[PDB]
Every structure is written in structure tokens, then in C-alpha cells.
């Protein structure tokens, strides 16, 4: 009853996708009838790069050769400084416009995130650099 | 047509942009680079408050 | 003007057999010459003037 | 790409593919000349012989 | 250094209020950083008093300085105060402010970062 169970005799197979490109062909009902691969064999790469299902004899170009790179290495220059950008903006007075101070920040780590912190600072739009990718890159001065 | 809906900071109204990357946008919700439709967001202090 | 589709040209009656899930039709040139009327389910054609 | 978001880079990077995908046609056009002046050379040569 | 720095030596009169900060240099305390303080006496262990979360929020206190000492933590300067109020005689001590390192995603199951600590006299 409640506990086990009789049933009769079944098969099932079970396969996992993979990123693949296909050539499929449509007959004049407009249903699919037929389909070759495209990096299975080289009959088949040459027959999806001719755009036909059948080949005349000679010899054929197909695609190129290359080497994938195996590990990724990052080089840095090890400072961590920590830039004092809270020097600039929390001052409690900033020269006029006719005589603007420039001060010069150099030899430490930048973030900007803390930059992006405060809720005033609205009108931040940046011409040469997207200002959403300032983290990623070493600046001269 | 279907509608997502949620009530968060004011500050955080930036981030749910698409491409866009900070606290909301990597553990509460996240948008596709490719995007079709858009948002809308209306400062509500008298309702939830 | 078939939802928001436009166009010009005649339409004539067609004998292509759409599966239920298929609205459009297409040529090597990407672009529609077979369309279903929404309202009456008939298969159309289009061709240019 | 390491300087721009998604949305003004494929303004810039358009304007360089066009570029490199027009240097490699005119190569290829002098190249017809060119192959179309030896061959009515290598006619002159296969009578004299 | 990455390092946490302590608040110099100062004497208050009894009856009065306190306060204690102690800073970082070089190191921020993100959403997962916690830190605890400690007073040292002369000549006498080490009794712990409570620890706080910068993330979460949640703080703890001994029950015997339940209402004789207020723990806050503050993310824009990345550091933590202390306020207490009516000192006695055995609060002539040393303070100290213990934090381990940790960066977003995990780190060590122990206290290595310190500092030098506060005298606080009574007089």
C-alpha cells in the first residue's frame, strides 16, 4: 500500500546542452528536416563554412588556429597610500573663483567610491574616463 | 508587460541601472546588461514614513 | 498597419500553413512578407507595388 | 574598452572598424589591377613561345 | 601601516562624563569588521567590556557596565566611542580598542590588531 510500489518496465536517457552553432534546413512546408553541424569534423566545418550540404572535390579553406591563454597574471606597484581626497572636499573654505587653488595629489592609492558615497555630489559626469571606471586604471598625476 | 516592485533608499535610486554596480545592485537586484522598458521612481516620505 | 508593423504594398490570400506558435513570415532578405490577421486568423501576403 | 561603459563605446569602436574594413578593400582593389596587367603579360609570353 | 591608533592620557574629575575614541590609519572597517574594548588596570587582568558590529549594527555590554558605558561605531571616519559618566576610583586605567583585519569576504578568527590604549585617571 502506502509503502513501495510495483510498476512496469521503462527507459530514459539523459544528455546536457552545450554552446554549439548549427545549419538548418527548411524544405518548402517550412519545417525543419535536416541539420550539420559546425565543430564536429572537418567535412562538417567545411560543409557550414560553403553553406551546402554536399562538396565538390579540392581543397578548401576553413578557419584558423589559435592558442588559448591558460592563467591570467595582474602587476601593480604596491604603495597603498590611501590619497587624501577628504582634504579637498570636507575644507572649511575654499579661495575664490579668480584665484582658484590647484593642490597637487601624487604616490598614493585612489578610491573613488567615497567619492561616490555622499548624496550632494549629483552632478558627476566625466568626459574622457566613465566615471563608473575610475578603479580600474594607474593615472600619471 | 510585467512590473517588479519595491521600496528603497533614496540614495540607492541610482544604482538600478543597467551596468551599474554598488550594494543593491549586486545582492538584492540586478538588471541586464541589455535592457528593454524602464523604471520609475517617486519619492514617497508621507506613506512609509 | 498589423500591430504596429508597417508597410505598403498589395495583400493577396496565401496558401503557407502557419504552426500555432508562428506569426510572421520572413525571406532571405530579413523582412516580413507574411503576416496572420489578428481579429480573423486568415494567412496574408505581402508583396511591393 | 578599458576607459568607457557600453553606452558611448560603440560610438568609438564603429569608427575604427569602418576605418580598418576600408584599408583592406582598396588593398584588395589595387591587387585586381595589378593581376589583371600580368596576365595580359603572360599572354604575350605563352605566343612568343 | 594598515593600523589602529589610540587617544592619549587624560585625567577627569569624578561625577562627569568621559569620552574615548580610538582611530585607523590606512584600514577601513567595511560591513564585516568588528572590534571590542578592554581595560587594563595596574597590576591586575584583563576584564572585557563589549563588542560591536559595523555591519549589523548589534552591540553587546557586560552586565556590570550595563548603563556606565555607551558603544557607538561611526562608517564615515571608520572608527568606534565610547561614553561613560560618573567615574569612580578603579576607573584609573588603561583602554584599549581590539579589531581584526577583514575585508568583505572573510578573515581570521582572532584579535591581532591593537592599539596602545588610553590612561584614564580620577582625581
Known amino acids: 500500500s502506502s509503502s513501495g510500489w510495483t510498476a512496469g518496465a521503462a527507459a530514459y536517457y539523459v544528455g546536457y546542452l552545450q554552446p554549439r552553432t548549427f545549419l538548418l534546413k527548411y524544405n518548402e512546408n517550412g519545417t525543419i528536416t535536416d541539420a550539420v553541424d559546425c565543430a564536429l569534423d572537418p567535412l562538417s566545418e567545411t560543409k557550414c563554412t560553403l553553406k551546402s550540404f554536399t562538396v565538390e572535390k579540392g581543397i578548401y579553406q576553413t578557419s584558423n588556429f589559435r592558442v588559448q591563454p591558460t592563467e591570467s597574471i595582474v602587476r601593480f606597484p604596491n604603495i597603498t597610500n590611501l590619497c587624501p581626497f577628504d582634504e579637498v572636499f570636507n575644507a572649511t573654505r575654499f579661495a575664490s573663483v579668480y584665484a582658484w587653488n590647484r593642490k597637487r595629489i601624487s604616490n598614493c592609492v585612489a578610491d573613488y567610491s567615497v567619492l561616490y558615497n555622499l548624496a550632494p555630489f549629483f552632478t558627476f559626469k566625466c568626459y574622457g574616463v566613465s566615471p563608473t571606471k575610475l578603479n580600474d586604471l594607474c593615472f600619471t598625476n | 508587460v510585467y512590473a517588479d516592485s519595491f521600496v528603497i533608499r533614496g540614495d540607492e535610486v541610482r544604482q538600478i541601472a543597467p551596468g551599474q554596480t554598488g550594494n543593491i545592485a549586486d545582492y538584492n537586484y540586478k538588471l541586464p546588461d541589455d535592457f528593454t522598458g524602464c523604471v520609475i521612481a517617486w519619492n514617497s516620505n508621507k506613506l512609509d514614513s | 498597419n498589423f500591430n504596429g508593423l508597417k508597410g505598403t504594398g498589395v495583400l493577396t490570400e496565401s496558401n503557407k500553413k502557419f504552426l500555432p506558435f508562428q506569426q510572421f513570415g520572413r525571406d532571405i532578405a530579413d523582412t516580413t512578407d507574411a503576416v496572420r490577421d489578428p481579429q480573423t486568423l486568415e494567412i496574408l501576403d505581402i508583396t511591393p507595388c | 574598452f578599458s576607459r568607457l561603459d557600453k553606452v558611448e563605446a560603440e560610438v568609438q569602436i564603429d569608427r575604427l572598424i569602418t576605418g580598418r574594413l576600408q584599408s583592406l578593400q582598396t588593398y584588395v582593389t589595387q591587387q585586381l589591377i595589378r593581376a589583371a596587367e600580368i596576365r595580359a603579360s603572360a599572354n604575350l609570353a605563352a605566343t612568343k613561345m | 601601516q594598515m593600523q589602529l591608533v589610540q587617544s592619549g592620557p587624560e585625567v577627569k574629575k569624578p561625577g562627569t562624563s568621559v569620552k574615548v575614541s580610538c582611530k585607523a590609519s590606512g584600514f577601513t572597517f567595511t560591513d564585516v569588521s568588528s572590534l571590542q574594548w578592554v581595560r587594563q588596570a595596574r597590576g591586575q587582568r584583563l576584564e572585557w567590556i563589549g563588542w560591536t558590529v559595523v555591519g549589523t549594527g548589534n552591540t553587546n555590554y557586560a552586565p556590570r557596565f550595563q548603563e556606565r558605558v555607551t558603544i557607538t561605531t561611526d562608517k564615515s571616519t571608520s572608527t568606534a566611542y565610547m561614553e561613560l559618566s560618573s567615574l569612580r576610583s578603579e576607573d584609573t586605567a588603561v583602554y584599549y580598542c581590539?579589531?581584526?583585519?577583514?575585508?568583505?569576504?572573510?578573515?581570521?578568527?582572532?584579535?591581532?590588531?591593537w592599539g596602545q590604549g588610553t590612561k584614564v585617571t580620577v582625581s
Open positions: 581590539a579589531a581584526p583585519f577583514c575585508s568583505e569576504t572573510s578573515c581570521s578568527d582572532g584579535f591581532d590588531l
